[PDB]
Design a protein around this motif. Sequence first.
Motif, PDB file in Angstrom:
ATOM      1  N   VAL A   7       0.860  -1.168   0.000  1.00 36.27           N
ATOM      2  CA  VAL A   7       0.000   0.000   0.000  1.00 36.27           C
ATOM      3  C   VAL A   7       0.913   1.239   0.000  1.00 36.27           C
ATOM      4  N   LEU A   8       0.612   2.196  -0.871  1.00 33.52           N
ATOM      5  CA  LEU A   8       1.374   3.435  -1.002  1.00 33.52           C
ATOM      6  C   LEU A   8       0.479   4.632  -0.812  1.00 33.52           C
ATOM      7  N   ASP A   9       1.062   5.738  -0.399  1.00 33.98           N
ATOM      8  CA  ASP A   9       0.375   6.976  -0.049  1.00 33.98           C
ATOM      9  C   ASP A   9       0.775   8.025  -1.078  1.00 33.98           C
ATOM     10  N   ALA A  10      -0.190   8.426  -1.895  1.00 33.03           N
ATOM     11  CA  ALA A  10       0.020   9.377  -2.988  1.00 33.03           C
ATOM     12  C   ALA A  10       0.036  10.839  -2.553  1.00 33.03           C
ATOM     13  N   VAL A  11      -0.325  11.130  -1.300  1.00 34.65           N
ATOM     14  CA  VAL A  11      -0.256  12.469  -0.733  1.00 34.65           C
ATOM     15  C   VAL A  11       1.135  12.755  -0.153  1.00 34.65           C
ATOM     16  N   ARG A  12       1.719  11.776   0.526  1.00 33.62           N
ATOM     17  CA  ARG A  12       2.995  11.995   1.193  1.00 33.62           C
ATOM     18  C   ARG A  12       4.137  11.420   0.363  1.00 33.62           C
ATOM     19  N   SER A 103      -5.234   7.854  -2.318  1.00 38.97           N
ATOM     20  CA  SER A 103      -5.405   9.294  -2.129  1.00 38.97           C
ATOM     21  C   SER A 103      -6.736   9.490  -1.353  1.00 38.97           C
ATOM     22  N   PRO A 104      -6.959  10.661  -0.797  1.00 41.49           N
ATOM     23  CA  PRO A 104      -8.153  10.809   0.053  1.00 41.49           C
ATOM     24  C   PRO A 104      -9.471  10.549  -0.689  1.00 41.49           C
ATOM     25  N   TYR A 105      -9.571  10.974  -1.955  1.00 41.75           N
ATOM     26  CA  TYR A 105     -10.801  10.813  -2.738  1.00 41.75           C
ATOM     27  C   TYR A 105     -10.641   9.852  -3.906  1.00 41.75           C
ATOM     28  N   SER A 106      -9.566   9.054  -3.931  1.00 44.22           N
ATOM     29  CA  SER A 106      -9.351   8.141  -5.048  1.00 44.22           C
ATOM     30  C   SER A 106      -8.438   7.018  -4.600  1.00 44.22           C
ATOM     31  N   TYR A 107      -8.629   5.806  -5.107  1.00 38.73           N
ATOM     32  CA  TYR A 107      -7.563   4.826  -5.002  1.00 38.73           C
ATOM     33  C   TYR A 107      -7.482   4.000  -6.249  1.00 38.73           C
TER      34      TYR A 107
ATOM     35  N   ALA C  99      -7.852  13.243 -19.793  1.00 39.92           N
ATOM     36  CA  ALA C  99      -8.161  13.415 -18.348  1.00 39.92           C
ATOM     37  C   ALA C  99      -6.927  13.254 -17.529  1.00 39.92           C
ATOM     38  N   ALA C 100      -6.757  14.096 -16.530  1.00 44.21           N
ATOM     39  CA  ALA C 100      -5.624  13.947 -15.616  1.00 44.21           C
ATOM     40  C   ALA C 100      -6.173  13.942 -14.216  1.00 44.21           C
ATOM     41  N   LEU C 101      -5.751  13.000 -13.405  1.00 49.89           N
ATOM     42  CA  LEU C 101      -6.204  12.916 -11.975  1.00 49.89           C
ATOM     43  C   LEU C 101      -4.963  13.168 -11.126  1.00 49.89           C
ATOM     44  N   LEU C 102      -5.013  14.190 -10.272  1.00 48.32           N
ATOM     45  CA  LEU C 102      -3.819  14.709  -9.589  1.00 48.32           C
ATOM     46  C   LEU C 102      -3.770  14.417  -8.093  1.00 48.32           C
ATOM     47  N   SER C 103      -2.620  13.956  -7.627  1.00 50.18           N
ATOM     48  CA  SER C 103      -2.320  13.945  -6.189  1.00 50.18           C
ATOM     49  C   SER C 103      -0.909  14.548  -6.039  1.00 50.18           C
ATOM     50  N   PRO C 104      -0.489  14.865  -4.820  1.00 46.36           N
ATOM     51  CA  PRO C 104       0.761  15.582  -4.702  1.00 46.36           C
ATOM     52  C   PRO C 104       1.962  14.774  -5.190  1.00 46.36           C
ATOM     53  N   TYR C 105       1.962  13.445  -5.018  1.00 52.08           N
ATOM     54  CA  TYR C 105       3.111  12.616  -5.441  1.00 52.08           C
ATOM     55  C   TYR C 105       2.749  11.622  -6.522  1.00 52.08           C
ATOM     56  N   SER C 106       1.617  11.839  -7.216  1.00 57.97           N
ATOM     57  CA  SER C 106       1.158  10.903  -8.227  1.00 57.97           C
ATOM     58  C   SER C 106       0.216  11.537  -9.169  1.00 57.97           C
ATOM     59  N   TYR C 107       0.257  11.151 -10.429  1.00 61.89           N
ATOM     60  CA  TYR C 107      -0.861  11.499 -11.278  1.00 61.89           C
ATOM     61  C   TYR C 107      -1.148  10.364 -12.234  1.00 61.89           C
ATOM     62  N   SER C 108      -2.363  10.377 -12.758  1.00 61.40           N
ATOM     63  CA  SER C 108      -2.750   9.451 -13.800  1.00 61.40           C
ATOM     64  C   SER C 108      -3.223  10.284 -14.987  1.00 61.40           C
ATOM     65  N   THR C 109      -3.067   9.766 -16.177  1.00 64.80           N
ATOM     66  CA  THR C 109      -3.660  10.437 -17.306  1.00 64.80           C
ATOM     67  C   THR C 109      -4.234   9.396 -18.232  1.00 64.80           C
TER      68      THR C 109
END
Lengths: 115, 116, 116, 115
Positions: A7-12, A103-107, C99-109
């Motif tokens: 499991v990985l954390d995309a925010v941190r 992520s908080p609103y997505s996984y 479409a791009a879905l954003l997080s601080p250390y990750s994104y998907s497109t």
Amino acid sequence: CPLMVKVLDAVRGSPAINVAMHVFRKAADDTWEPFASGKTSESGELHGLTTEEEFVEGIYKVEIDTKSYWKALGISPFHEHAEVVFTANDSGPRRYTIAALLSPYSYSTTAVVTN
Amino acid sequence: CPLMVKVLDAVRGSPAINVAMHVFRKAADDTWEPFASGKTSESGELHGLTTEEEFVEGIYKVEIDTKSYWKALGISPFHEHAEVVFTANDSGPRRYTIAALLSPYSYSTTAVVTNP
Amino acid sequence: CPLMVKVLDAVRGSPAINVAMHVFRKAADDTWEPFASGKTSESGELHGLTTEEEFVEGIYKVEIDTKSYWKALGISPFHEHAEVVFTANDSGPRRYTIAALLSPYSYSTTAVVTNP
Amino acid sequence: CPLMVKVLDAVRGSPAINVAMHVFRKAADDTWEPFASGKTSESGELHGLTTEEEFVEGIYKVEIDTKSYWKALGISPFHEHAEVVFTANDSGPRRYTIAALLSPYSYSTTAVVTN
Ligand SMILES: CC(C)=CCc1c(O)cc2oc3cc(O)c(O)c(CC=C(C)C)c3c(=O)c2c1O
Ligand SMILES: CC(C)=CCc1c(O)cc2oc3cc(O)c(O)c(CC=C(C)C)c3c(=O)c2c1O
Ligand SMILES: [Cl-]
Ligand SMILES: [Cl-]
Ligand SMILES: [Cl-]
Ligand SMILES: [Cl-]
């Protein structure tokens, strides 16, 4: 171990540490029988859930307690949990790595099935 | 509508059409009660599942039948279904768009929550 | 339009509003020439970048300024930008939604490509 | 090695093997200077790209040749490549693992930054 979860954390940008999860096997009456659980390590991994002899063909669910993880961080999450439901071993025993990126609103969840 | 689901296919670069899904609501006795169901349209969207008055506070589950979608395209996928479980309307009515992006061994799901 | 970009924020569960992006087209001399630019609207969408006649065959790059988006929300993200590079219209005109879905250390497109 | 890249295949449920990539560092004239490259192993990983001494602060790009991978499999892809552009080490040297999950019309990329 034929089943590992990471499991990985995309925010941190980090492994998601101390994430609890439970693994269930679907019974003949269509209910979910618990059979293994644990929490992720400092590397975001949970190993040793099962053995090759025990991990027979069937439908399995991994329920990952993502909501408690986000609560621990003070960040409002959308999902109650992330569920991964799959049939195992349908062509014989495989090694399964289930990965979840949170992520908080997505996984996202992916399976890597190898030999 | 207060609840909409959009499903996309990451192998073909298209909406995922005719994908079945069932929505359930957690009852007072902790069982999953049927709430609504439908199939995605040619745009990969399923609208009209519920109404503002019916969609009260609670815990809802959307079970998207991704396995039948892939099997009809000739693919044996990993997941039985994609499940989205969430508490709705806890701080008053919201509009929820759930998006699911599908591949044979992976899916992502996202929610966009707006205040009507 | 033949090219639309949608950007979503996976931390807040919302469209990603006022995200800048620049589109480039690969020239005959292999350099990236400016093609169009814009910012996402309140729906997280950027429309009107080009026209069917202008959007000829070629290799296009969309550079989405995700770093400025996160920095304005107080976050120091990993990526400088999200880049989407693709060949367009190789088998005749198509409509492209990126479409791009954003997080601080990750994104998907993702791309959804439809035949007009 | 302070930089590792791992690539997975969401269509086959496997590591993405023999995927080529190049790493660039942004020069003072705003051009991309190549400096490392390789192809992923049977585990989908590429190790040994750089050293702690060499991997100084700066802006780096990893360009992953996803289009050749999908071509090798006979599956029509959307992207020319997947690009990952980031500033390194802005708070001191870190270990960076860049993960990429590939589908023909979509990819995801994540960074796990640890000690
Ligand atoms: C058993 C094997 C060859 C790979 C299993 C495996 C692994 O050992 C480590 C991994 O680290 C990852 C680290 C990430 O930051 C990451 O994003 C992924 C992909 C997970 C997603 C986007 C569902 C993975 C990932 O899938 C992954 C992964 O699938
Ligand atoms: C033109 C058409 C049939 C679909 C194009 C399209 C769209 O019009 C709206 C969309 O909203 C989305 C909203 C989401 O929360 C979402 O997660 C996606 C999936 C795309 C990712 C994970 C990059 C999409 C998505 O791909 C998407 C999308 O692909
Ligand atoms: Cl999604
Ligand atoms: Cl949306
Ligand atoms: Cl990823
Ligand atoms: Cl990792």
